[PDB]
Amino acid sequence: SKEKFERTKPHVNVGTIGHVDHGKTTLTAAITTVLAKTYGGAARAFDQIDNAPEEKARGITINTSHVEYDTPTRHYAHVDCPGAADYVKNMITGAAQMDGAILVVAATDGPMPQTREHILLGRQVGVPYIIVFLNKCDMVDDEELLELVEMEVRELLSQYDFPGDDTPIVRGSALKALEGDAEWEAKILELAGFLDSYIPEPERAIDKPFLLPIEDVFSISGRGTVVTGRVERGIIKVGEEVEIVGIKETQKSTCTGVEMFRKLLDEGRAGENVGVLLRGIKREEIERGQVLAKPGTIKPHTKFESEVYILSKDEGGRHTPFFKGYRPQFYFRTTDVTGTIELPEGVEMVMPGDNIKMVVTLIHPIAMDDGLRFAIREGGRTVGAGVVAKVLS
RNA sequence: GGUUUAGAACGUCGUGAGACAGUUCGGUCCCUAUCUGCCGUGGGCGCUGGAGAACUGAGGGGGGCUGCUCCUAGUACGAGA
Ligand SMILES: Nc1nc2c(ncn2[C@@H]2O[C@H](COP(=O)(O)OP(=O)(O)NP(=O)(O)O)[C@@H](O)[C@H]2O)c(=O)[nH]1
Ligand SMILES: [Mg+2]
Ligand SMILES: [Mg+2]
Ligand SMILES: [Mg+2]
Ligand SMILES: [Mg+2]
Ligand SMILES: [Mg+2]
Ligand SMILES: [Mg+2]
Ligand SMILES: [Mg+2]
Ligand SMILES: [Mg+2]
Ligand SMILES: [Mg+2]
Ligand SMILES: [Mg+2]
Ligand SMILES: [Mg+2]
Ligand SMILES: [Mg+2]
Ligand SMILES: [Mg+2]
Ligand SMILES: [Mg+2]
Ligand SMILES: [Mg+2]
Ligand SMILES: [Mg+2]
Ligand SMILES: [Mg+2]
Ligand SMILES: [Mg+2]
Ligand SMILES: [Mg+2]
Ligand SMILES: [Mg+2]
Ligand SMILES: [Mg+2]
Ligand SMILES: [Mg+2]
Ligand SMILES: [Mg+2]
Ligand SMILES: [Mg+2]
Ligand SMILES: [Mg+2]
Ligand SMILES: [Mg+2]
Ligand SMILES: [Mg+2]
Ligand SMILES: [Mg+2]
Ligand SMILES: [Mg+2]
Ligand SMILES: [Mg+2]
Ligand SMILES: [Mg+2]
Ligand SMILES: [Mg+2]
Ligand SMILES: [Mg+2]
Ligand SMILES: [Mg+2]
Ligand SMILES: [Mg+2]
Ligand SMILES: [Mg+2]
Ligand SMILES: [Mg+2]
Ligand SMILES: [Mg+2]
Ligand SMILES: [Mg+2]
Ligand SMILES: [Mg+2]
Ligand SMILES: [Mg+2]
Ligand SMILES: [Mg+2]
Ligand SMILES: [Mg+2]
Ligand SMILES: [Mg+2]
Ligand SMILES: [Mg+2]
Ligand SMILES: [Mg+2]
């Protein structure tokens, strides 16, 4: 909180996706040390990406950490996702804000169950583009074995409905590029080139009014409570009226400084992860899931009609019918929430793989409008995608 | 220290003397080693002229405990942990 962030080079939200213990977090560390040395940006290190007691004694990552590496064309903002089956909820928040992923499949093990689960969540939420990275390579000194893993990833993406064969697969060791090997430093400099080439300039919504979903809340010692998240639409000027809408009720507030990776900003534009400092709010009373909207634009609702598309076994979801009283988890912008289903008259049962509308009473109210996209999940897996039809409350 | 002598007390049983793995406080533990055995340490003669050294080895004894840290490798194994 000192150096003013100059608005130069387009902002893009990147992040690593893939199986557990697969080089996902270690890739993030390799990208920093490679790009910092040659181009001449800020250095950083691997330990900073995940410290705490929970990511040392174990080794695994839980929290969605963030990194800021710069290149001549664009200014990237990384989002290192967790990866394990237990941490899918706090991942989806990291994956939703992310524009273009970096998938991580490995040349020894290959595509494994979570890789399929991650990319499934990527489609239904919103992950336009994806890039593969083989994160072992050196351990198996062979030409035929390593190239057979590439084939199965192209199959995976194309099977699940991505380009597949068009996606630029890259090979490279994360640990070798951490030290100073000239051949492996250049091969992850190549990944930065693939990020610029394949992923285009993202399409922002800097016109329609302000909204910002809260991904994580902080309490800065001196300044006050801060909320982080990608600005979904509009802009944020310093000293502007902001209404916090969602769970519990609704509270009035004002912004007192927006930032971008511990650097000051004047205008927090759309499509970029920013830490908004709110005035006169406690750490406990503001929770995760709520949205920073402009006063009057959005209203919290506990009941709504919605055109729900239930999934079948082939697409990946339920395989049995259900009646009124069923309670799955509804993932809106960031958080999830439970809700009772009330079906329309003249519909006895809801079969899997079917398009119908339904009234859904939620236990917590969440800020929503007509034409909001959500993805229903239950039992550690997906259920059905859909859209909001009408407001009731 | 306990049990198992003589003192004294409690509860209990006995008319009483007293009695009770019922309890309670106090209450002398001797021996210079002949033989066997054992640990040491010598004298005697033998081993075939005597003497001084240096070995050989039959045979006998000694010793044999094991942690955790890292490296292999977060490798195999595992959906993950
Ligand atoms: N030999 C070799 N090992 C690698 C390479 N890249 C990563 N690894 C190792 O693979 C392990 C995975 O660690 P990490 O990347 O933190 O796990 P992750 O991919 O973020 N998944 P999660 O966070 O869910 O546990 C580490 O031991 C790391 O050193 C590589 O190119 N070669
Ligand atoms: Mg493994
Ligand atoms: Mg990780
Ligand atoms: Mg592990
Ligand atoms: Mg394995
Ligand atoms: Mg396997
Ligand atoms: Mg204040
Ligand atoms: Mg006695
Ligand atoms: Mg007595
Ligand atoms: Mg007597
Ligand atoms: Mg009598
Ligand atoms: Mg007696
Ligand atoms: Mg007795
Ligand atoms: Mg008694
Ligand atoms: Mg007693
Ligand atoms: Mg006594
Ligand atoms: Mg006495
Ligand atoms: Mg006594
Ligand atoms: Mg006595
Ligand atoms: Mg005495
Ligand atoms: Mg004696
Ligand atoms: Mg004597
Ligand atoms: Mg005597
Ligand atoms: Mg004797
Ligand atoms: Mg003897
Ligand atoms: Mg002897
Ligand atoms: Mg002797
Ligand atoms: Mg002798
Ligand atoms: Mg002799
Ligand atoms: Mg003689
Ligand atoms: Mg003789
Ligand atoms: Mg003689
Ligand atoms: Mg002799
Ligand atoms: Mg003879
Ligand atoms: Mg002879
Ligand atoms: Mg002789
Ligand atoms: Mg002679
Ligand atoms: Mg002689
Ligand atoms: Mg002689
Ligand atoms: Mg000798
Ligand atoms: Mg000798
Ligand atoms: Mg003998
Ligand atoms: Mg011998
Ligand atoms: Mg021996
Ligand atoms: Mg022995
Ligand atoms: Mg040992
Ligand atoms: Mg290890």
Q: What does the alpha-carbon distance between residue A129 and residue A300 come to, in Å, rounded to a whole number?
A: 32
Q: Is the CB of A334 under 6 A from ligand 1?
A: no
CA angle (A100, A234, A212) in 5-degree steps:
70
Under DSSP, the state recorded for A344 is P
Phi and psi (nearest 5°) for A306? Answer: -160, 135
- Amino acid code (one letter) for A335: T
- Those nucleotides of strand B lying less than 7 Å from any protein Cβ are 74-76, 78-81
Measured from the Cβ of residue A263, the count of other Cβ atoms closer than 10 Å reads 14
Interval between CA A337 and ligand 18 midpoint (Å): 79
Measured from the Cβ of residue A223, the count of other Cβ atoms closer than 10 Å reads 12
Phi and psi (nearest 5°) for A153? Answer: -75, -45
Q: How far is CA A268 from the centre of its chain?
A: 19
A216-220 and A339-342 as β-strands: parallel, antiparallel, unpaired?
Answer: unpaired
Cβ atoms of residues A116 and A160 within 8 Å: yes
Asked if residue A140 keeps its beta carbon closer than 7 A to nucleic acid strand B, the reply is no
Looking across all nucleic acid strands, the nucleotide with the smallest C1' to CA distance from residue A136 is: B75
Cβ atoms of residues A256 and A279 within 8 Å: yes
Closest Cα to residue A91, out of A173, A10, A20?
A20
Q: Is the CB of A181 under 6 A from ligand 1?
A: no
Q: What is the DSSP annotation of A233-283?
A: BS-EETT-EEEEESSSSEEEEEEEEEESSS-EESEE-SSSEEEEEESS--T
Half-sphere exposure (Cβ direction) of A360: Cα atoms closer than 13 Å: 28
CA angle (A199, A205, A210) in 5-degree steps:
135
What Rg do the C-alpha atoms of chain A give, in angstroms? Answer: 22
Angstrom distances, CA of residue A182 to CA of A189, A221, A250 = 11, 43, 55
Interval between CA A127 and ligand 9 midpoint (Å): 97
Measured from the Cβ of residue A293, the count of other Cβ atoms closer than 10 Å reads 24
Interval between CA A320 and ligand 17 midpoint (Å): 92
What are the start-end ranges of the E strands in A272-353?
Answer: 273-278, 291-293, 300-310, 329-331, 339-342
CA angle (A196, A201, A206) in 5-degree steps:
150
Phi and psi (nearest 5°) for A277? Answer: -95, 115
Looking across all nucleic acid strands, the nucleotide with the smallest C1' to CA distance from residue A113 is: B79
Q: What does the alpha-carbon distance between residue A67 and residue A219 come to, in Å, rounded to a whole number?
A: 20
Under DSSP, the state recorded for A69 is -
User: What Å value separates CA A3 and C1' B25?
Assistant: 90
Closest Cα to residue A326, out of A368, A366, A358?
A358
- Amino acid code (one letter) for A194: F
Q: Helix H segments across chain A?
A: 24-38, 88-97, 113-125, 144-160, 174-179, 182-198
Q: Is the CB of A64 under 6 A from ligand 1?
A: no
Interval between CA A82 and ligand 32 midpoint (Å): 97
Token couple for A80: 């290192």
Q: Is the CB of A139 under 6 A from ligand 1?
A: yes
A170-171 and A129-134 as β-strands: parallel, antiparallel, unpaired?
Answer: parallel
Token couple for A372: 């909001």
The torsion of the CA quartet A223, A224, A229, A234, rounded to 10 degrees, works out to -80
In chain A the first and final C-alpha atoms are separated, in Å, by 42
Q: Resolution in angstroms, to 1 decimal, for this deposition? A: 3.0
Token couple for A64: 């969605």
Q: What does the alpha-carbon distance between residue A69 and residue A31 come to, in Å, rounded to a whole number?
A: 8
Token couple for A296: 């009057």
Q: What does the alpha-carbon distance between residue A154 and residue A240 come to, in Å, rounded to a whole number?
A: 48
Closest Cα to residue A17, out of A108, A125, A159?
A125
Token couple for A60: 């695994």
Q: What does the alpha-carbon distance between residue A89 and residue A87 come to, in Å, rounded to a whole number?
A: 6
Residue A379's contacts (CB-CB under 8 Å, 6 or more residues apart) are none
Q: Is A101 helix (H, G, I), strand (E, B) or coil?
A: strand
Q: What does the alpha-carbon distance between residue A246 and residue A129 come to, in Å, rounded to a whole number?
A: 30
